A and B are shown apart, each in its own frame.
Chain A
Amino acid sequence: SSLSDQLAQVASNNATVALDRKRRQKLHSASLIYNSKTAATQDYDFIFENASKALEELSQIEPKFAIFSRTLFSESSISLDRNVQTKEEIKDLDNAINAYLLLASSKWYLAPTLHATEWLVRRFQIHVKNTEMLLLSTLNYYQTPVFKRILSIIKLPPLFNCLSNFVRSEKPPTALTMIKLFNDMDFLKLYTSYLDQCIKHNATYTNQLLFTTCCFINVVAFNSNNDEKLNQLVPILLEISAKLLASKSKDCQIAAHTILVVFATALPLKKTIILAAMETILSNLDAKEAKHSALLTICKLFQTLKGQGNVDQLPSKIFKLFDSKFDTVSILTFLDKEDKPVCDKFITSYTRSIARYDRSKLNIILSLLKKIRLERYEVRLIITDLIYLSEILEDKSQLVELFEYFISINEDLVLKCLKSLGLTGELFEIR
């Protein structure tokens, strides 16, 4: 490499040190409130005292900023210089800055957080040192002047490369620019680690979940025509779906439901992946809107399932788990809705799992398959395992009235399954 390249590397290392007055002015005029001519003449005491006022306002709004008043906004930090302590003190205060940023990511619509993080911008130089976490935290606010301001004063990371024509510009970045930003794979790994820290420290708020889910399903939509990009993309977004389903927020759970339903209708996933996805869906299902989205998600994920094995009995563990999260009244009511969801293959798998695993609730399967209409292969498999139920256990009135329903519609088909296995006079002598 060349000498100017190696010197650009040492400039990028020494970016924040003010080595004379002109660099100090150019480096201290980068404010988030004031313009450059006021910001260059301000002091540390002035910006600290009104940032401490704004942190008291932000702390009486949300009381988790008081420990930042203890450490990051204390009065020892007026004289704390960033690039004079070692790497271990640097990583201490940079996870302090990361904690503040992913706590105050939600508060970015109210001016105390602007005047408070003004002091992180001007004392700790987080627009050029801790800049990836700053962009990732305020990414939701991209139509707003506060994201315009941080783009004007930011030094843009190499992963955020497509925002480089919207820095120091008067127009906001557009939604197609946001999808082009999210369309990378390394950016997707970065954003999923950011969400992992959000989910861990319990700071996921609904505007973030909406923006994140919108950009994720637009990434899947953009890559919907190349299977190798979809296959690069599956263990990233299904991993973040698992980590959103493994939390307590109903909003982040149905965000994961949205990601799972778009991804399963974008490409045909494996049967075992779909079953483990419904196990992870049911294993933390506690809300009601989450239950609504969870039933619709499990129905569509079973609908988008092809081949030999789409409508087996779902196994005993996952069927009794689905029973413990959704009883009979819930399933029957949801099928009785006039909007008519498409629940064909899932309801077939459900009734076959009832016939292999319950053997008491057969009047309810008569009522629900009276409600919704199925296909020929669905009802053929249903009456074949009802035939096997008749041959294993003694045939009472619930199985008899089920066969009366399967005689009252499509009696030629039940004749075809009895002639494929058994006989009609022998079956009438059975029951």
Chain B
Amino acid sequence: SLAKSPASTIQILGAEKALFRALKTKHDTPKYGLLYHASLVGQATGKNKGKIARVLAAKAAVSLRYDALAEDRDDSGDIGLESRAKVENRLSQLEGRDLRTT
């Protein structure tokens, strides 16, 4: 039931009361939810923790529905590990940029 949910839901999955009050009046929705306490979002700083909460929820949807829907799964962490490498170098490339002018 978690695997058949879209990645945006997996992003906002913990923050339902903030989400639905910010939808039932026309306000801005949260961006973290239950996924805020992941170590990668801990490594991010600024608005790009919203950004990598989004990319982490996307890769977590990929890995999660692989885990729930695979049959020849090996319990070895391969898809989760390549997804984590994707999220880590993405976090690198948006922590390398800086809004200052040098």
Asked whether B96 lies within 8 Å of A162 as measured between CB atoms, the reply is: no
Asked whether B96 lies within 8 Å of A165 as measured between CB atoms, the reply is: no
A180 at the interface (CB under 8 A from B): yes
B98 at the interface (CB under 8 A from A): yes
- Do most interface residues of chain B lie in helix, strand or loop, or is the interface mixed? loop
B25 at the interface (CB under 8 A from A): no
For A253-269 the 0/1 string (1 means CB < 8 A from B) is: 00000000000000000
Asked whether A174 lies within 8 Å of B96 as measured between CB atoms, the reply is: yes
- Report the bound CA distance from A162 to B98 in whole Å: 12
Number of chain B residues whose Cβ lies closer than 8 Å to a Cβ of chain A: 7
Which bracket fits the contact residues of A? under 10
Q: Which residues, 53 to 101 on B, are CB-close (under 8 Å) to A?
A: 95-98, 100-101
User: In the complex, which residues of chain A have a beta carbon less than 8 angstroms from the beta carbon of B102?
Assistant: 162, 165, 177, 180
- Report the bound CA distance from A175 to B98 in whole Å: 10
User: In the complex, which residues of chain A have a beta carbon less than 8 angstroms from the beta carbon of B96?
Assistant: 174-176
- Report the bound CA distance from A175 to B100 in whole Å: 14
| Closest residue of A by beta carbon distance from B45 | A171
Asked whether B100 lies within 8 Å of A165 as measured between CB atoms, the reply is: yes
| Closest residue of B by beta carbon distance from A180 | B102
Q: How far is the CB of A63 from chain B (nearest CB, A)?
A: 40
- Report the bound CA distance from A162 to B101 in whole Å: 8
Give the contacting residue for B97; candidates A162, A165, A176, A180; CB below 8 A. Answer: A176
Of B95, B100, B102, the most chain A CB neighbours within 10 A belong to B102
- Report the bound CA distance from A250 to B102 in whole Å: 35
For A326-356 the 0/1 string (1 means CB < 8 A from B) is: 0000000000000000000000000000000
For B4-30 the 0/1 string (1 means CB < 8 A from A) is: 000000000000000000000000000
For A167-192 the 0/1 string (1 means CB < 8 A from B) is: 00000001111001000000000000
User: In the complex, which residues of chain B have a beta carbon less than 8 angstroms from the beta carbon of A176?
Assistant: 96-98
User: In the complex, which residues of chain A have a beta carbon less than 8 angstroms from the beta carbon of B95?
Assistant: 174
- Report the bound CA distance from A177 to B97 in whole Å: 9
- Report the bound CA distance from A278 to B44 in whole Å: 46
- Report the bound CA distance from A162 to B96 in whole Å: 15
- Report the bound CA distance from A110 to B97 in whole Å: 30
Interface residues, chain A, CB within 8 Å of chain B?
162, 165, 174-177, 180
Since A165-B101, A174-B96, A177-B102 are in contact, a sample of 4 more A-B pairs with Cβ atoms closer than 8 Å, ordered by chain A residue number, is A174-B95, A174-B98, A175-B96, A177-B98
* A-B pairs with beta carbons under 8 Å apart, 5 shown: A165-B100, A165-B101, A165-B102, A174-B96, A177-B98
Q: Which 9 A-B pairs have CB atoms at the shortest separation, nearest pair first?
A: A162-B102, A165-B100, A180-B102, A174-B96, A176-B96, A177-B102, A174-B98, A175-B96, A165-B102
